[model samples]
Target: TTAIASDRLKKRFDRWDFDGNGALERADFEKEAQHIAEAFGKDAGAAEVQTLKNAFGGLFDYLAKEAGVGSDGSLTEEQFIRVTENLIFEQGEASFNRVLGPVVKGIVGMCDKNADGQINADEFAAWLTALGMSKAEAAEAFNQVDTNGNGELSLDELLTAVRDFHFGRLDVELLG
Candidate 1:
């Protein structure tokens, strides 16, 4: 169980290490923000873009605090997996989401490109593709998240996927 759990957390750490620098740090999250902004045709001056940057940086800081990696606060893969596995196994999903909420909001805010309060098929594809999914894989993810078959993803739908993948309820290698 421990090994399996650690493997799952490892995948998440790899997902966030955007620059492949072998560490999870504030700069990595910032890079992800910039990449997402570029993909969305947004620039640094936009408020949602700023939130994306801030939220991701905040995630690094928060995880650093929780993991207590006091020196410079960048997480090694071992620390990330250990700390995250502890959080999931010990603190449970709701508490994890409390910390995760702002980052999710930042993602949706930037991804909703048209400011329509919900993610349409194209927006969803772009969002997933930005996270390293292929266009086709993004479409598959969209199909999974579009629970009502309505061709749109509500916040609730995305949140459900977040909880399912991040919290170990699903094992399909999605939501990375």
Candidate 2:
């Protein structure tokens, strides 16, 4: 039934696994992991990278088995949405703040491009489009998060707004 997802997952697995041994090797994991960590100013050692690869591989295998999907090396709409949601909202079970704090802050800083403390809809839209969102979707998503109805979003508001958009588990309101 989900052979498509399974195949897609398998393709991703092969690309990232590098050695094509049906499992991720430490060397490849370390290189990619370190690059990602460095981008965020974090230290990802070989051991840590290996552990992460193991955990992620396990999760992928579990999803493939349970969904009865095979990896075809490309993501279907459903698979893309699921994978993106997991990456944005789950962050390997880390809190949204912990996982996305830096990235979100960076984006907010860019939104305040003129060194201003607020971001208008256009500014927000530009940022979203940069992230590959369509103009309409970006506008919709921007409006959805600007809870104060002020037509502008502050950094604090933007962070909480995005957090709430993906994860409804938080008690904080975007308006605040």
Candidate 3:
């Protein structure tokens, strides 16, 4: 009854299972935040840690309603599928941010440092790295998504680049 492939669903779940705990928890979010901070040798302060923790806590609060996440205090693979795959079909673009936003934020947040609404060349490459894209492929994707020929990716081009990268030209409207 789901539109997305089960394998794809599992892939995303594995990505979110940051601690190999077989479930997504507040701690996984904390670990993921720490990992991101460490991945680039950045010494993220306590405030950054608190922000991610709070954001993820909010996300889980949101998920509890939509994905059947319960007081078990952890999100399972079944819940992950519902969160990442099923809800979009049932809810349309209305659910994209809640479903995909946290994970996507992890990658793009690396690039969109300073909350600047844009990503430069190095940032784009780093984002691609998190996606497991090769250097050359990252360059190609960078070219394809850099629509203004200005050598930067703006917040506006995100949907296009994402759709183009994974599934070409999916007519998603209004990312906000």
Q: Which candidate is the best by lDDT?
A: 1
**What tens-digit string does per-residue lDDT give for candidate 2 at 123-146?**
877656654557886677667767
TM-score of 3: 0.67
Clashes, model 3: 0
Candidate topping TM-score: 1
| Residue 152, candidate 2: C-alpha displacement in angstroms | 1.1
Q: In candidate 3, what are the lDDT values of residues 1-176, reduced to their tens digit? A: 54445665566667567768888776666666666666656567655554554555565665666655563477788777666554544566645565446545544555566776577777777756654556776677667777788887765555556633122333221110
Error of 2 at 169 (Å): 13
Error of 3 at 111 (Å): 3.0
RMSD after CA superposition, every candidate: 3.5, 11.0, 5.3
Compared with the true structure, all predictions reach lDDT values of 0.70, 0.50, 0.59
| Between candidates 2 and 3, the TM-score winner | 3
How many pairs collide in each candidate, listed in order? 0, 13, 0
Better of 1 and 3 by lDDT: 1
Ranking by lDDT: 1, 3, 2
- lDDT pick, better of 1 and 2: 1
